[PDB]
Amino acid sequence: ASLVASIVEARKKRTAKKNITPYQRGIIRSLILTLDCSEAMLEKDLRPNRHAMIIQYAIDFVHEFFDQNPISQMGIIIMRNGLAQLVSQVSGNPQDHIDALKSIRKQEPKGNPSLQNALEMARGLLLPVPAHCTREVLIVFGSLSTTDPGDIHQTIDSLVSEKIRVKVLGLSAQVAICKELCKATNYGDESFYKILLDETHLKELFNEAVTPLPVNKINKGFTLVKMGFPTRIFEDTPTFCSCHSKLVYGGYFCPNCHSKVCSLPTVCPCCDLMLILSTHLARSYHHLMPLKTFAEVPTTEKFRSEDCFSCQSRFPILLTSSRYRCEDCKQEFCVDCDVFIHEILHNCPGCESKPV
Amino acid sequence: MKFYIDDLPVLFPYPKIYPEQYNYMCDIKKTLDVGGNSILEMPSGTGKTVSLLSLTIAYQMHYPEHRKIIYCSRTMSEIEKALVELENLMDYRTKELGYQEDFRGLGLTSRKNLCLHPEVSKERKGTVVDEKCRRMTNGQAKRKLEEDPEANVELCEYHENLYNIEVEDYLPKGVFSFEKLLKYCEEKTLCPYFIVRRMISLCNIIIYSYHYLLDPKIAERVSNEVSKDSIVIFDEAHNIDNVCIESLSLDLTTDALRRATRGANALDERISEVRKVDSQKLQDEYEKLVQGLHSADILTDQEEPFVETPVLPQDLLTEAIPGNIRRAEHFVSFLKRLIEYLKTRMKVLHVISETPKSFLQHLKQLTFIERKPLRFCSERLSLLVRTLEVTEVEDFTALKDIATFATLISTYEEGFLLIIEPYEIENAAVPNPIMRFTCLDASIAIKPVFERFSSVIITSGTISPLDMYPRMLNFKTVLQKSYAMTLAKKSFLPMIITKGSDQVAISSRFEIRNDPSIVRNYGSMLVEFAKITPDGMVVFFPSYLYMESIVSMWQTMGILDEVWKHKLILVETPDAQETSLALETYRKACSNGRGAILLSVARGKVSEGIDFDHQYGRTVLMIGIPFQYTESRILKARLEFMRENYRIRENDFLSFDAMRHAAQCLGRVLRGKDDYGVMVLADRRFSRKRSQLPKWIAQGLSDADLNLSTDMAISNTKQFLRTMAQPTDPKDQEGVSVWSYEDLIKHQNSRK
Amino acid sequence: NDERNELKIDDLNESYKTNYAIIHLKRNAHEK
Numbered sequence A: 001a002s003l004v005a006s007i008v009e010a011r012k013k014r015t016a017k018k019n020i021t022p023y024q025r026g027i028i029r030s031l032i033l034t035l036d037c038s039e040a041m042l043e044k045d046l047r048p049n050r051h052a053m054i055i056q057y058a059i060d061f062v063h064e065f066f067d068q069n070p071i072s073q074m075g076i077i078i079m080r081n082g083l084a085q086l087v088s089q090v091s092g093n094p095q096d097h098i099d100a101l102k103s104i105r106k107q108e109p110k111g112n113p114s115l116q117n118a119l120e121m122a123r124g125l126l127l128p129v130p131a132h133c134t135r136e137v138l139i140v141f142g143s144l145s146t147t148d149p150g151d152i153h154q155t156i157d158s159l160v161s162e163k164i165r166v167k168v169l170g171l172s173a174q175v176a177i178c179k180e181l182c183k184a185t186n187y188g189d190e191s192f193y194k195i196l197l198d199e200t201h202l203k204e205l206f207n208e209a210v211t212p213l214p215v216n217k218i219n220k221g222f223t224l225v226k227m228g229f230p231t232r233i234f235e236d237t238p239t240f241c242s243c244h245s246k247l248v249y250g251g252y253f254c255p256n257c258h259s260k261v262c263s264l265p266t267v268c269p270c271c272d273l274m275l276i277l278s279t280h281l282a283r284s285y286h287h288l289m290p291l292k293t294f295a296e297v298p299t300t301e302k303f304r305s306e307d308c309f310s311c312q313s314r315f316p317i318l319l320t321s322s323r324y325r326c327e328d329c330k331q332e333f334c335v336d337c338d339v340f341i342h343e344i345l346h347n348c349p350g351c352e353s354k355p356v
Numbered sequence B: 001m002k003f004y005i006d007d008l009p010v011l012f013p014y015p016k017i018y019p020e021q022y023n024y025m026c027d028i029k030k031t032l033d034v035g036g037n038s039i040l041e042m043p044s045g046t047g048k049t050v051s052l053l054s055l056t057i058a059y060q061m062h063y064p065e066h067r068k069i070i071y072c073s074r075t076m077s078e079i080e081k082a083l084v085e086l087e088n089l090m091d092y093r094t095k096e097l098g099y100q101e102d103f104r105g106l107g108l109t110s111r112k113n114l115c116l117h118p119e120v121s122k123e124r125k126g127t128v129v130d131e132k133c134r135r136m137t138n139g140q141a142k143r144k145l146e147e148d149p150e151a152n153v154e155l156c157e158y159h160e161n162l163y164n165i166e167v168e169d170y171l172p173k174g175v176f177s178f179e180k181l182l183k184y185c186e187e188k189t190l191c192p193y194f195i196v197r198r199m200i201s202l203c204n205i206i207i208y209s210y211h212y213l214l215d216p217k218i219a220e221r222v223s224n225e226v227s228k229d230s231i232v233i234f235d236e237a238h239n240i241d242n243v244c245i246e247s248l249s250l251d252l253t254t255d256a257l258r259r260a261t262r263g264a265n266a267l268d269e270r271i272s273e274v275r276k277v278d279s280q281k282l283q284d285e286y287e288k289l290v291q292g293l294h295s296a297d298i299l300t301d302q303e304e305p306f307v308e309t310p311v312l313p314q315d316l317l318t319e320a321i322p323g324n325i326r327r328a329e330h331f332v333s334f335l336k337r338l339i340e341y342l343k344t345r346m347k348v349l350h351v352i353s354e355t356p357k358s359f360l361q362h363l364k365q366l367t368f369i370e371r372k373p374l375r376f377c378s379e380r381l382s383l384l385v386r387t388l389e390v391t392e393v394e395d396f397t398a399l400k401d402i403a404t405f406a407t408l409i410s411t412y413e414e415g416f417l418l419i420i421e422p423y424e425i426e427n428a429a430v431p432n433p434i435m436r437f438t439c440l441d442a443s444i445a446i447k448p449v450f451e452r453f454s455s456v457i458i459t460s461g462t463i464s465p466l467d468m469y470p471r472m473l474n475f476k477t478v479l480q481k482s483y484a485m486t487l488a489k490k491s492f493l494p495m496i497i498t499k500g501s502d503q504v505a506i507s508s509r510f511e512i513r514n515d516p517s518i519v520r521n522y523g524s525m526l527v528e529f530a531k532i533t534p535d536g537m538v539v540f541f542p543s544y545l546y547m548e549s550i551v552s553m554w555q556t557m558g559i560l561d562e563v564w565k566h567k568l569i570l571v572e573t574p575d576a577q578e579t580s581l582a583l584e585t586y587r588k589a590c591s592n593g594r595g596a597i598l599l600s601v602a603r604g605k606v607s608e609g610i611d612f613d614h615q616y617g618r619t620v621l622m623i624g625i626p627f628q629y630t631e632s633r634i635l636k637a638r639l640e641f642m643r644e645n646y647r648i649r650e651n652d653f654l655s656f657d658a659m660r661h662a663a664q665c666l667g668r669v670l671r672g673k674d675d676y677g678v679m680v681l682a683d684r685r686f687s688r689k690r691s692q693l694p695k696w697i698a699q700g701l702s703d704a705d706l707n708l709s710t711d712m713a714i715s716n717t718k719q720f721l722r723t724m725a726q727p728t729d730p731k732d733q734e735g736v737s738v739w740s741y742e743d744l745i746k747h748q749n750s751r752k
Numbered sequence C: 001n002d003e004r005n006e007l008k009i010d011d012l013n014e015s016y017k018t019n020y021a022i023i024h025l026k027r028n029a030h031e032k
């Protein structure tokens, strides 16, 4: 009955994955990562300490976020001594944020946190963002109390007026103001206030925060954005770069002003034009055309082939059929493949192979 | 939703309904259909008022009897909450039935809470407000103005404007809470107090407090208007015995007697002056008295007696005045010598407890005052004060206490006692004698209600055990039961802490109140729990003196300094306005995330109606069993009377009294089933009181939490909060704790 | 109004429903 228990647990896990719909998502994101560095973060519930674990997971989150959202931007704020300290300006360079976190990890946390100060700083940082981008603020809260100079409700109302979206990750227990913020700022949705249960669940929450958030039906900001695809240049002599004013072997040439830029994607330093590559856009097509879930075949019916279509592997033989099929093409897949096609790849080999 | 009972359609104001609510409504309907009284205990985390109002309103609007509804709560804030719930229910009914059905529902309270006069509503006491309103509405001013317009006496525009319109057009059809009523009456310059007092006889449902139903001083006039076949609901009736006892209890002090002598002398001088100038009034009053008329036949409906009837209407003699107090001067001399006898009895050197019969016999021996003339003191004084044109009654205010005491002691003899103590406060340099006339039987005040009304529902969240209430108050119930909430996941964590982190026993015994170990243990518990509590933390102390002393000790030790870093501190104070402002500040601090801790008395003003739910109430620290002061003559006499009559042991009754208040405070944490909290009972003596707690709390109290330590309770609290912070699975509560219409229909089909 | 909102039992109200917009991406592009 233990093996059947494992099978039923797998079925329950797949139950959530069954419901998938092509929700509209805002690929162009502007995220403000607020971290809590207060006396309450000196506890040892997370080894070695909350500050160390949170900073490490923040570094990993930055890597993943800039891996899967090339055309997004991020900024870093911390809460110390009841004040909001900016440590990274909004920019598209992951290395700057990684270095900022590496600098932050040293200082010992102390003082009290100030959600109102952090939110005001985030609003100021997100003011100069285009209307077509999604303004988001991810806060890692650890304290159970908030000390603020002004009225937090007014700040919440201002955030709602500015159409900013706030996600809060707690450590110990729910805070009433945090719940109200995450609810009123997300059109009443109460699923954006998460309290972790352990280190693994914290990692899962951080990974979940990476994917873009679906947009609201009534919040329409549809528009066309002027972007250009530069051509890489290979030169024999180093030349001055127009972004950092430093010598580099080569750089991408903007197609609107011919100025060279070190790395992409970044806003052109001369014509204020966004420079991106086709791959950067290609990285987000799976968020617009998600692959439909695969449903296991009951053992009552007859199987098609004894080996996996995608990997040519013998199906294990024993109670519960270890087969997964794609409704679009009706091709049996093994359990090992299913996760790979639904986590790494985003195209069904059977669907691609089937002619029309 | 809109579902059906055996023959009664009921419209619930929510798309979802709890199984506890459905069973509660079914039981209430069964009680109403079968006739008689019933006792219902519903969990505090499940909607009780909404279910009561829905079922009763549907019953009244469906059956042809159209029996009216009387709702009796324990506090005015509860009246406001009930009125708001009724307004919501009526809004839902109006939206579902397509029209506003003919319905009128009002609350009722005193003048102080409904006065709009800019010069009379600015008083700090209700008696002065009542006196001024009487001066403006008795009809003396109106008659004087009619006879001579030049008279400087002024009237109340709000009262005068009511005469223009009829009673049936005072307010539009609907439900009027106090807030909406005040707004409407301010926009139309009308008196809400008189509107309610003149519309009680017409409203479908009337909501007031237990004092307006039990206290004869204000109960007779209101009860004379309500119907006899109406439904009666007692909400939060676990503490009704205290109200019933304080209804018929009086206290007289040396200052009171000294002021009564001055009042009597002033009355004699007034009688002399009126005899000199205008004696026809005295002659007319004497002539009317001779025939056998009383205050009812003499006073007009517009005016009220100066002295409120202190005895129940059924115990008032219907015979003419005895004759000894028929004349003003004779009555004044009688009253003066009564006051002198009280003064000479206030000189005892040791506690004396005596029956009213013994007191009357000694009075008849030393002086020549008989029982019958004494029984008419208040009525005769009311008539005399009415006829003496005493517009200013500041001097005569004192005589009210003497009249009340005389009319009570000469009326009741069984279940009443008189205690004379040379030391009102034992901690006093000079003796301060006090005379207390106490009612020991709690059923005397409530017998008329249980006999006048056929069906009575007694409902509460922490009324247990249910067997004692029929014993204490002489009434019988068709059914008495408590409901077990069908929670899918535990939402409240009740635990008992018997010792501190050092393994030293902790208790709130008064004799060891100033103990460094116990005080430090309690302070450490407070700080540790405040460190983990997210938003709000309510601490309930056994008594205000204990709270004051322990808080001062904590201040000296520096524990409050540690608490200040994590939360604001709000403290209950004797001043009601200051306490209300403290409550508002505490709620604001809980809402804005700053975090707050509120210290209060388990038997205080907060615990008698203020409810802490969601963000407001997260952890409840019951610091010690709220035991009464054992070395109290009144409590000892009551315990002896109960032991002799109802065969209730003193220890059993004391434990019941304390556990009732502990549960009362505990139950103010949950509103719905999505609310959660930690309930810590910090005393070694709770460990054996699990069987005495309400059923829904005992079921949630695990065997491993019967005797815990501070550190282990902190760990359990942290784990519980972390667990309760996760999203609930909808399937886990889809049809096991929350029922939709289809689930309700399935339950009905399976049951049938 | 505000008192009604505070006194109402939220747990018994209808569950919040997401209002996210769905999109269907047609694929028809001319050759280079």
Ligand code: SF4
Pocket (backbone or CB within 6 Å): B111, B114, B115, B116, B117, B120, B132, B133, B134, B136, B137, B156, B158, B159, B191, B192, B193, B194
């Ligand atoms: S009639 Fe009404 S408004 Fe006027 S003094 Fe009396 S209670 Fe106040």
Ligand SMILES: [Zn+2]
Pocket (backbone or CB within 6 Å): A241, A242, A243, A244, A245, A246, A248, A261, A262
């Ligand atoms: Zn450069």
Ligand SMILES: [Zn+2]
Pocket (backbone or CB within 6 Å): A254, A255, A256, A257, A258, A259, A268, A269, A270, A271, A272, A273
């Ligand atoms: Zn350019």
Ligand SMILES: [Zn+2]
Pocket (backbone or CB within 6 Å): A326, A327, A328, A329, A330, A331, A348, A349, A350, A351
């Ligand atoms: Zn396929």
Ligand SMILES: [Zn+2]
Pocket (backbone or CB within 6 Å): A308, A309, A310, A311, A312, A313, A333, A334, A335, A336, A337
């Ligand atoms: Zn495979």
